[PDB]
Ligand binder design. Structure first.
Ligand SMILES: Cc1cn([C@H]2C[C@H](O)[C@@H](COP(=O)(O)O)O2)c(=O)[nH]c1=O
Ligand SMILES: [Mn+2]
Length: 179
């Protein structure tokens, strides 16, 4: 029974916590042992939902947060109706305005490096990438950041708050060093 586990449960809403637990169980991991991962998944989930909330109504299809089978079903529906190429890995959102898949990343390290490591790993030229860090930096494909500055600013504010809460509990160093 770790401090990080109870921190995560008292910091994130129950809907995110439950989706994160399901994700980890589907992968096969355990929230009680792999607790920095539990925190990372919750964080990613929240950011992806804050981000979809940044557009106009119906701008984004939300892929993140669904069961893997249903996630791919929706990806295939989008592909088969917009003629866009099918990605090799599951993205997080689809942008109906710009007609592209997006993969949002959240890193405790250098944005630059996480971006690159994401580009290669994706192996899907068409998928747009947008990285945020816990220090307030962001990096987007072709410097096209999708949302307006205010919607991104609130994401960054939220990440820095998570960082502080963790640091006040002496959990940050461990979370930072475990990426
Ligand atoms: C950075 C990081 C992400 N993740 C998770 C968050 C997401 O659920 C999933 C995809 O993350 P990404 O899109 O930020 O790469 O992997 C970890 O489990 N551990 C980590 O250290
Ligand atoms: Mn992502």
């Amino acid at each position: 029974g770790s401090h990080m586990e109870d921190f995560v449960r008292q910091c994130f809403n129950p809907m995110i916590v439950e989706l994160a637990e399901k994700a980890m169980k589907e992968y096969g991991e355990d929230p009680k042992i792999e607790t920095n991962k539990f925190a990372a998944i919750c964080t990613h989930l929240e950011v992806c939902f804050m981000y979809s909330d940044g557009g106009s109504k119906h701008r984004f299809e939300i892929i993140e947060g669904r069961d893997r089978i249903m996630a791919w079903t929706v990806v295939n529906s989008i592909c088969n109706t917009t003629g866009v190429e099918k990605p090799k890995f599951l993205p997080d959102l689809y942008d109906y305005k710009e007609n592209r898949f997006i993969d949002i990343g959240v890193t405790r390290r250098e944005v630059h490096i996480y971006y690159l490591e994401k580009a290669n790993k994706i192996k899907s030229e068409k998928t747009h990438i947008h990285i945020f860090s816990f220090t307030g930096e962001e990096m987007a494909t072709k410097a096209d950041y999708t949302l307006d500055e205010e919607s991104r600013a609130r994401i960054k504010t939220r990440l820095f708050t998570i960082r502080q809460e963790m640091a006040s509990r002496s959990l940050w160093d461990s979370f930072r060093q475990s990426e």
